């Protein structure tokens, strides 16, 4: 549905809500890889510019207006090439960066989805509603890939049986 | 019990554009366009500019009586003139291949004025030549690097003069001719009605005959002066022969030339600053790959671009919940 | 497997087949966002071109062929820069656009997949075969995110038990 | 977790491990489409370059240094345009190519995931651990999209019941 | 019961290329390359071109007897000549700094012919000079903006003439010299065997001596005419002094010059159209960012590209089921 | 039992860069930058270069006594000189519009030396003129395509000579003038103290007066020679008139000119090779779109780029398990 003010310690992460309370935890692994990926993008865009000494000046007289005009077509030529390519390069890389974040979020979602399976239901908002009770330790266990699903499988099944009747 | 997956938000109002979406508010962003300048003329890679306030290159080289004379720098990376300068040629004229001269002087590794023919060495010609469009402090005066020769007694013997460049540096030499308004002025000034200047080098082979004609008064003057130059190589000699109308060198310039820049037009003042990139509206801190300050830049500059904004999304969409 | 002639009212959508009949329904939400995304792409490509007045003409004489040649290197220079960049820009954005559609289709598929769960099976062709009976209202309910899964869970389970025996 | 030395016959594929042994099998369909996609990318990058005859030479004398300087700004101008655009074009297409492979791998993974369902569990490493016994024929059947899930559904269920108790 | 997810198809055969895939049939597409033109020469941003049919700029300016004389437009945005024009210099010659002249006249904000020295003001020289390569209707004739002076009685007194540009507009002035074939022609035409033209302005200081030599007959003529020009500034005067061989101004041109374009070569005809971008093969509707019409464009044009096709996929793959 | 999904690996250490990641090891890759050359000067699209070893274009055209004389190729695609060549003008001088001449001769479709005025046709002038900076085998000698005329008996009658280009090919003609050091040399060599050269074509109308002045000795010589040229069109005639100081054509050149290239500076040797793209450091196999060999290329070349590396990932990440 959106972003999260409360996740102040990372880019991507988790919000949990249980009987013991609620709060945000960041995935520092995928965050730091994003923060390095995007820093390379910017640095590449900047550092690939090769610049040498130039002195652009108007030094043709009034019997050399054909050469002044040649120099003008040139300058405008380069202005246009640079203006368009820099404008489009920003647009294209921005779409790429924003998709990169969406991709990272979706991957963090999948790591959870495979862990929970039928022990929780997908709400379609990036959340999972557990069938069983998930304490603070259970939540930590889902974040760090340690969730062990047999411990709750029996408890969770009866609870979908309860829903289907 | 729920666990959600999501992403960071903050109070940022920084907006970015994508190919497909305009004005996406984003958590962090980085402009790659340089838009700020310091409002000052600066040294360029450590070397001061030659700043001619209201002086042309021509009037500065000829030693114009108006122009300041402590305008001697050993070296400069670019030249700055005002957009419209006021001290050009006091006597109406022109300089031959002037634009090539300006361009050659735009960046100089070493420059040093030396006296090549003393004013006092003219024993049988008058050196005192002067005009009322070239005052210095109140007395009609002239250019200080160049001497107007005129007849002495009532005669102008053929001048035959040579200068061997003994320095190991190349020499920029200047001279001119005076184009009088009529034959009466011609003989009044030079005696000989029919007259030539010949100038010779290992490279130069010049012959000038003055053009004596009726002309528009410019600053009250109907005569003209035309200036010429060359680079006299290290062990080469320059030879002058004339029986009139010759405006002779007094001083010339040792010159070392290793590269070029240009002439900037700027109203600005010299700050005490150093830059890799100077603009006529100020200097620029040349880290970004693109700028929108001014097209006429000197140095190692970012690429000039017609844009207000080049902002790269770095963080995430800022659509808070 | 392909596209659909019959979906004339939108870009992405659904085809359903039940006992009451069969037909196509478009997702107008994701369609209109696509139709705006692609319109921005085209408009950006066109509107970022800065063009100023130029008069390209051949006005050097036969003792100025070095300058004519300079002017020629320039013109060919710009022709090549523009030709290559425009050709590659089309190629790159086309791959991006076609992937954008694939991404939108896949998202519409996921919205359905999370809703159905074990009440239907994935056929691997972008379709779901229900275990239970899905009437015209049931189909509408799957399209507009309203499908309620308990009502059919019991009926659907016995029907996979029937298949497993 | 990484790539596979042992998959010498294709780009993407499968490794299986059962009681009869273990080994690699390539998906030749998606591999050949990748090998054609990437060959088009390279060929487009190369073949879109239009090149004509040019003679770049320094033929201005020492009273034509303003024109020599114009010719220099031009040459450096083009050098910079080409240097930056070629450098960035490589960077951008490389990210695209590497994502293309990731996309192809993920699709091959999904084809398997929909086939197995609850008859296997996802390990989160691109593998599936079967609940039932999957012989060499069963493995082939999963590779070529032929896996028939009813035959093992009953056997597989009791085996998750065994785990939940 | 089944529900499927999928996408739109239609009857479209529009194909697009991707980096990785060639000839992908697609539902909708948009070419960003402009390929069509209207086959006509048009006004450019609202201003008509100066269309010289079979006339050079030189012959048009000199008032060539062949060329049409209702070729007076107050203003023009570009000039069009034919690829090879037939009415250039009737008498063999050349124009000095011709290419700079053409370029300067390529776009003019205001242009107006004015009489500067009446033909009838030459009291002691013949103004009736004429040649058989410059017929007008059957009688040997000449350029109408310029007068061939020759001796009267058997004499050619020194001409001393000035014209002060009283207009606030700058003035384009033309004159020439006649280079005879030999001394006999020289004195037959001008009496004085040894001869000069002097021309003076606040800027110009010219001296022409005719070159009398044996030469190739061109249109039966062994003599040559050479034309020259300047821009006489608003309150400046031009001064002419000659004792022979002088081809004098009769009419000059008030000129206002605010920018440039060029000379287009086109066989085409003027349509009654308006464009932002003109090509020598037709005008172009400058909305797309790229075109493949012709390289020699004038106006605010799309970028010229060596392509048949630049097609952006907009809709979906069209692979129907 | 397990089934895994995954991708290929191999022993490759080829690294690629992405926008976001540096030094990604990859299974297969393709450099799009051409970095290798063959170290030889080659035919360009099948046509041999004109290779002047230690000869200038000027000395080659004038028939310099040092330079080799089997330097006659019917046709060439570009010219190669050494970086600093040793056989330029034996007698100090210069060539007028030299750079335009070099450029015009840089690519020639047909070239053929023909005798235009035999040395033996000068009945009343000496043709034997020679200098000690132009030896050939030990005797003071001269350029072979051009003749130094001097007085015979004690006289120099006006020369009046024409040559009608009967060939259907255009003709490159060369001539010069001698600028003596003083009037004594002038009359010693030519008798007539006051002297001119006149040269006439349908296009050319030239008048040269020698400049007699004191000058720097260059190779012991204080006199100068200045050379000039034109293209004499197919049925056009060239006319020469002079009473001294004329350095006359003996041979001229049939020339067909369909396009241009340039003058390459290279120390290299001709290999027996064919290329579409030549560089001064070697030829290049012009398949890739970019190269980093050298900027001064001739032919249909890849784009010059300031890079070590342009490597396109083709295969997969190589992170083995
Ligand atoms: C500006 O002044 C300079 C002098 O300060 C001029 O340069 C000198 O000119 C002389 C005379 O023209 C030339 O040199 C003579 O000596 C050389 C040998 O030079 C070599 O040895 C020198 C002496 O030790 C070194 O100093 C040099 O670097 C070099 O190693 C002789 O070979 C010449 O001999 C020939 O000419 C004579 C004179 O007629 C003949 O009679 C002989 O038979 C012989 O064939 C020279 O005599 C040299 O140009 C130079 N010398 C020095 C020391 O610099 C310079 O020319 C002047 N510029 C102008 C334009 O006038
Ligand atoms: C083409 O014709 C034009 C005239 O129609 C010429 O321009 C005029 O020339 C005169 C004489 O050369 C110059 O002006 C004289 O008056 C000025 C004052 O000008 C100022 O006031 C004017 C009069 O009211 C205004 O009209 C002007 O716009 C301006 O405001 C005096 O200062 C001068 O005085 C000096 O020179 C005299 C003459 O010897 C000395 O004796 C004095 O002692 C003093 O030092 C001028 O006399 C001016 O150039 C101009 N005047 C006008 C009204 O336009 C034009 O020159 C001509 N072009 C050529 C090339 O000949
Ligand atoms: C280098 O030599 C060439 C000759 O070998 C010169 O070219 C010739 O010059 C002659 C005389 O100048 C000109 O031609 C005369 O004949 C034409 C007809 O030419 C046409 O028919 C020719 C004859 O059959 C063909 O050969 C041509 O290709 C073409 O089809 C007449 O019309 C002319 O007549 C006019 O001039 C005479 C002479 O005074 C008048 O009396 C007449 O009344 C009439 O008005 C010419 O006489 C032509 O230039 C050319 N001829 C040929 C055959 O080539 C060339 O000029 C020379 N170059 C220089 C610069 O001198
Ligand atoms: C969002 O898109 C709009 C287009 O509607 C952009 O509009 C320009 O905004 C600039 C920046 O201040 C104004 O100077 C221009 O006048 C606007 N153009 C037009 C045609 O209205 C707007 O800039 C975008 N905003 C941002 C912050 O990126
Ligand atoms: C599909 O790819 C082919 C390459 O096999 C393209 O071939 C060119 O098609 C044009 C357009 O009509 C022809 O003029 C050229 O001769 C073809 N080139 C070659 C080398 O054969 C083809 O254009 C592509 N088709 C489309 C419609 O984009
Ligand atoms: C990986 O990135 C590094 C940056 O740390 C690149 O560094 C350059 O490597 C080149 C190639 O041999 C050296 O010549 C340069 O000196 C390095 N630059 C700097 C600033 O150290 C490195 O090239 C990359 N490696 C590859 C193989 O692509
Ligand atoms: C966000 O921006 C505002 C504006 O400057 C700033 O004052 C505020 O403190 C910022 N908030 C945080 C948490 O940094
Ligand atoms: C599709 O294209 C054809 C060709 O013009 C057209 O006649 C036909 O009617 C179109 N079909 C539809 C449904 O618009
Ligand atoms: C991989 O590279 C090395 C280095 O040349 C080569 O010798 C080795 O045989 C290669 N391995 C294979 C399987 O091709």
Residue numbers in the entry:
A (entry chain B), C (entry chain B), D (entry chain B): 11 to 175
B (entry chain A), E (entry chain A), F (entry chain A): 1 to 321
What does the paper say about this structure?
Influenza A viruses infect both avian and mammalian species through binding of HA to sialic acid (Neu5Ac) moieties on the surface of host cells, and viral host specificity is determined by both viral HA structure and the type of host receptor. Herein, we report the antigenic properties, receptor-binding specificities, and crystal structures of hemagglutinins of three different H5N1 clades responsible for recent fatal human infections in geographically distinct areas: A/Egypt/N03072/2010 (Egypt10, clade 2.2.1), A/Hubei/1/2010 (Hubei10, clade 2.3.2.1) and A/Anhui/1/2005 (Anhui05, clade 2.3.4). The overall structures of the three H5 HAs are similar to that of Viet04, comprising a trimer of HA0 protomers, each with a globular head containing the receptor-binding site (RBS), a vestigial esterase domain, and a membrane-proximal domain with its distinctive, central helical stalk and HA1/HA2 cleavage site. Highly conserved residues (Tyr91, Trp149, His179, and Tyr191) formed the base of the sialic acid binding pocket, surrounded by three highly-conserved structural elements: a 190-helix, a 220-loop, and a 130-loop.
A profound difference in the amino acid sequence of the RBS in Egypt10 is a deletion of Leu129 coupled with the substitution of Ile151Thr (del129/Thr151), a characteristic found among the majority of circulating clade 2.2.1 viruses isolated in Egypt and reminiscent of the HA from the 1957 H2N2 pandemic strain. The structural consequence of this deletion/substitution combination is restricted to a minimal rearrangement of residues 128 and 130. There was no perceived effect on the overall conformation of the 130-loop and no change in the association of Ser128 or Gly130 with Thr151 relative to the other H5 structures. Furthermore, the deletion of Leu129 in Egypt10 may produce a distinct antigenic surface in the 130-loop of this virus. Notably, this configuration of residues in the 130-loop is a characteristic conserved among nearly all contemporary viruses in clade 2.2.1 (termed 2.2.1 group C), as well as a group of viruses in clade 2.2. An increase in Neu5Ac-α2-6 binding has been associated with Lys189Arg (present in both Hubei10 and Egypt10), and the deletion of Leu129 coupled with the substitution Ile151Thr (present in Egypt10), has been shown to increase viral binding to Neu5Ac-α2-6-Gal and infection in the airway epithelia of humans. The substitution Asn154Asp, which results in loss of this carbohydrate among clade 2.2.1 and 2.3.2.1 viruses, leaves the proximal residues exposed and potentially subject to selective immune pressure, thereby enhancing antigenic diversity among Egypt10 and Hubei10. An exception was Egypt10 (clade 2.2.1), which was covered <8-fold, compared to homologous titers, by antisera against the three other viruses.
